[PDB]
Amino acid sequence: FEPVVHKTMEEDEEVLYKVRAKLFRFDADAKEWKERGTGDCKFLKNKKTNKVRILMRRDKTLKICANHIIAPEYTLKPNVGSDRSWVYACTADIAEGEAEAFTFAIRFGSKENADKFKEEFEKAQEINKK
Amino acid sequence: SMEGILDFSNDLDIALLDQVVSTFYQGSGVQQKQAQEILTKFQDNPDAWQKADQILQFSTNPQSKFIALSILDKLITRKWKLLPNDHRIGIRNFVVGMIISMCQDDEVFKTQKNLINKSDLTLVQILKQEWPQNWPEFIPELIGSSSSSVNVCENNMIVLKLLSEEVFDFSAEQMTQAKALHLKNSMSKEFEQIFKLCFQVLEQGSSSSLIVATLESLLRYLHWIPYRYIYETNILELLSTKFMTSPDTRAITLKCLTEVSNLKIPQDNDLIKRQTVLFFQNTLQQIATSVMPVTADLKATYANANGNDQSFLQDLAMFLTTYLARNRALLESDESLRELLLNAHQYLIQLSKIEERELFKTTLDYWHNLVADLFYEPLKKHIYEEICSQLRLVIIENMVRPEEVLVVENDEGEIVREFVKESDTIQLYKSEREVLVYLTHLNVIDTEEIMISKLARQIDGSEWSWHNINTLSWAIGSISGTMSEDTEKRFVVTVIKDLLGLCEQKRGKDNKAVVASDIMYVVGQYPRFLKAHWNFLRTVILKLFEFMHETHEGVQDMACDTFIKIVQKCKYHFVIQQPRESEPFIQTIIRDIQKTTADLQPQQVHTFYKACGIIISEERSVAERNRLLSDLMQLPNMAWDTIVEQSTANPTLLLDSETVKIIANIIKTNVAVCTSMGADFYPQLGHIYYNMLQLYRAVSSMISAQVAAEGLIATKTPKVRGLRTIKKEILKLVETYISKARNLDDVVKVLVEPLLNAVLEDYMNNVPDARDAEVLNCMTTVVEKVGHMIPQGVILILQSVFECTLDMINKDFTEYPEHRVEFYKLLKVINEKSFAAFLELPPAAFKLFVDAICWAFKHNNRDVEVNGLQIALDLVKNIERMGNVPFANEFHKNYFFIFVSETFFVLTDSDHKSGFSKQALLLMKLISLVYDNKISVPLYQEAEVPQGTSNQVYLSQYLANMLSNAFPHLTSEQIASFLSALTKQCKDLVVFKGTLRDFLVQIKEVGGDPTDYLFAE
Amino acid sequence: VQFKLVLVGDGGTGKTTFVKRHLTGEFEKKYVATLGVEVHPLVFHTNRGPIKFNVWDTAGQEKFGGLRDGYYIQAQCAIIMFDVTSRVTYKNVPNWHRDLVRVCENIPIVLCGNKVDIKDRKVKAKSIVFHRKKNLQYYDISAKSNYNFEKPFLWLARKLIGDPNLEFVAMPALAPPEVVDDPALAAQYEHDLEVAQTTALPDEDDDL
Ligand SMILES: Nc1nc2c(ncn2[C@@H]2O[C@H](COP(=O)(O)OP(=O)(O)OP(=O)(O)O)[C@@H](O)[C@H]2O)c(=O)[nH]1
């Protein structure tokens, strides 16, 4: 008896770290932070290159608000307002198309999360050197 | 290149206009933005209207012609009466001529529906200005032209539709009362001719586009035409049969039949009743034969969303509910109408299964209307048993999440904490419970059996799912109050027993979290049961304690909220000793309070102590209550005592950010207990009061030191936000206590002086960014409860906060938003309760008081604006109460006309429409002051006006001058007639308001009729 | 595949805020009145490919209205916006709707009550019935909390594509540049990074 007849680009990556976060970019002209998105921050290790990137998608729209290599060169810095955020300059984020530079800030739900993120961020940097 | 069209010195290049229009509508990026600005300037140029004839003749771009009509529409509505007679006739001619020409070319009539519907609106604007006083034969000649061409016949149905809309549906806001009445009367006079033309097309008309347009015109006529046009012709039969069979006329007919199901109709005449029954019989017949049978799955139809099915099912829902709400009694007595009554209701049952929140609410409104009537109306409910029984299943199976349930399923399928309140869902849940409560009374055996048997199919796992245990539990909870103590006893026992079995069986944190949230919703909803059954209540409370030790934040949070909820209703059963118990349950809870709350986050621990507060306030013996209180506060008082011995041994231990957190949590714990115990909190407050005010002082210095060392950016640091939180929570604790206190002596003699000494100077002498708005809030509660007992204390509050807070908020409407709000709340209560304080201001500062009030008017922030107008009203009454004494006479000379003109400015500027009612009431009170000769001295200065002439006469002369200069396009007579009417109406608010709305219409145009202000007289 | 969307409603209702949240992710707190119209491309990714809305964000203030109903010509869908904290903005929903359907007969339209995040709500859910007879979809939304912020676009996409099962899906994610400039060798680093550290992040009292 005949039967009744019937790509994210993350399938080749492994999830090392996941944390809920809000991401901002600094607008140098206006001198204010502007939100770029709220959602899951993921550290994704490519199984073929062992390269680790940040990838972060906005809740509901699933649109990319961060896509960049966790570069050895980058440095996490505190922000005067917050014991649960980091600030750093990224020179190649492709979330909104062509490679652009940004000063990001990323805030978490608790200092614990921010301290874990920093620990994981530096682990991924070691992975990217080798 | 494109900027050429703005240069009016040269002839308008029409090819260029058309490119600029194309670039805007069809282009993109900078080119489109460039074109947008050029077109907006072209259109606003006040001589652009002189070019419209040129553009309508020569343009090859419909959108250019659309914009020419926009330009004309702005001239017709606002400056028409200044045009000389030749220009009005000419413009009339080429609009009428353009319309006819466009209709007589079939290709234009087909493709350019936008441009024609805009021309038709523009013509209706000319009718609002000219008809019928300078165009008496418009309607007859429109009827005439209709038979020349099917296109012109149809287009003329659109013109009359627009005319009906502008005169009956949208007149209230856009014309004076007099002019709306004139145009209403004018259409009413000529409707007989209009209806006969409309009726001929419905009987005889071939063209589907012409029929549709005719019926669209009739939808509008049904808002206002007398019933005799609907009931004494054949139109009901036509709509309810012929126009329902064709799908291209079905939507608009069904909307016409909905409006008919509301027409104004006599309820004492058997033949009008038969006709109302008939069109309904006819419509339900056409639906059952031509669209779908009663048994059809409307849910699936709606989900598939083919063509206009969603629209049609929406309009059907609206038709059935409108008609049945008004007329179901007509089908309820006659046995020949029973099948039709129940089939109509069956259509609504099928519609109520559709997955679409807003439709579901539309039907649920109807179900409420029905089950409410069946609850009260004798001999009716038996008719609807089978409908009511089906409705029970629909609602139990589509219950949405109550406010109380804090666990919810996310879009990766995890059971998580609820991110935010869904006001939409919460209201829907309440609407569902009102219906389901009613249905339960109508048949309590049916409701129990449905719920009991659904529970049995969760037990044995056959229909088990998170959706299915959730809807059942929410429904089971929603019906508390509907049963007897006895069936409730067994019902609830069975539900609790069986739900506890689901929790004990089911594995994984997701399953346990769901079942636990359901157990908690249910037991929370049945206080009556819990009161009577100590062992159950005790075990539910002991189970809430077990959930407070779960890893899932949602389960924990809800356990605390359920605890509060149970305790608000069962507090008595914890305060006394039950039989078979060692001690009152309160005392057992207070012992283990450290163990039972160990895994709770702080704001949940605080909720827990608030609950203990509620229990403790059930004990009325003063001895026991002060003790229980002292026993509860052991942990935080023990932390407080050790934190105050360290903190005063050196001001530097507070730097420890951990100690700032511990401290704020101890004050938050006190805030929580005070919230629920109110006036019974006094002993515990006093155990910390003087030491707590010293911490306020200590913390305040560190804040000021940090700002000076690090700059303003210090206010943003974790350290300083932590310190400011200690200050806010202390203010909140005192605010909370004083709001509820009964012993007001102790408040004035023990609490007030140290509080004012601790907070006022520190507020006045800190930089704007370091000032806590909570100080103003605290002070509002102090003035409200004890102001009358502390006149000099109120003076002291004003001096400390008035000028410095005003200086923060008087540069713009945005900065220091909390300050702005709390500020105007403080000045309202002071002006209400302690007005002497304003008498004791130096004249310069009283002048800033008046400037601050008027500044509040001009806010679009509602919290400020409403307080602004209330202060102004209360001030005017305070002043009036003083009578004929120098300060009141000086007040009126200095400030009367400033209040009048500042009230007029916000009335007439079109940016404060939210405050219209209160503005009008203030302006009325001010004008009426002068009439009732309550102002005891001349408002005018010495050599301005004849000696002896009254404040009344001068009020009108000042106001005529003020409006003449503020609105120079008005005539002297418009201003004279407006004021004459406005003044006579200073006791009748509704009429006065009407005269103001009339003025607001006339100031947006030229040549308003002065006699319009006689509408009331 | 692109559709003209007009966004209309009273001044201060949150139209430009709503659009900016969708374009960039940002929450604009200031009220800068739109002058006539601003057009913004907005793309969403769906299980039926990309859908693009040309969003014609219009002025609500009379004195800044510009071309007014002139903006509605050839619109394929629309959003009417009012403010649940401001009764006058709901009382004006019928006037915006009138002006719109006289130009755009038979297009899909969403009614949006914005600012439901605000505690003291003036236009209660039970008041909001205007959409029923006019066949508008209604949503409670908040551009601030993002409550239901995606729904207007998801519903409209469903009606314009004629597929009621259409979902937003995870937009593809290309491997990002692995060779990058050390930002610490670019001179303005010290000036850019100090300014960013010493400007406080907004809303430090939010949950994120
Ligand atoms: N609390 C809250 N405020 C909001 C929300 N959306 C917008 N606002 C604020 O309300 C104001 C309205 O901003 P706009 O978006 O410019 O208003 P608009 O409707 O575009 O006004 P016009 O351009 O004049 O028609 C801003 O200060 C916003 O930050 C919301 O969801 N919640």
Ligand SMILES: *[C@H]1C(=O)c2c(O)cccc2C(=O)[C@@H]1C
């Ligand atoms: C206009 C009209 O066009 C018409 C058609 O098309 C058919 C039958 C009757 C009429 C009229 O009398 C209407 C004037």
Ligand SMILES: *[C@H]1C(=O)c2c(O)cccc2C(=O)[C@@H]1C
């Ligand atoms: C009240 C009123 O205010 C008034 C003024 O001020 C001038 C002239 C006539 C009147 C009235 O008749 C009103 C009763």
Ligand SMILES: [Cl-]
């Ligand atoms: Cl004018």
Ligand SMILES: [Cl-]
């Ligand atoms: Cl609500």
Ligand SMILES: [Mg+2]
């Ligand atoms: Mg805007």
Ligand code: NA
């Ligand atoms: Na009727």
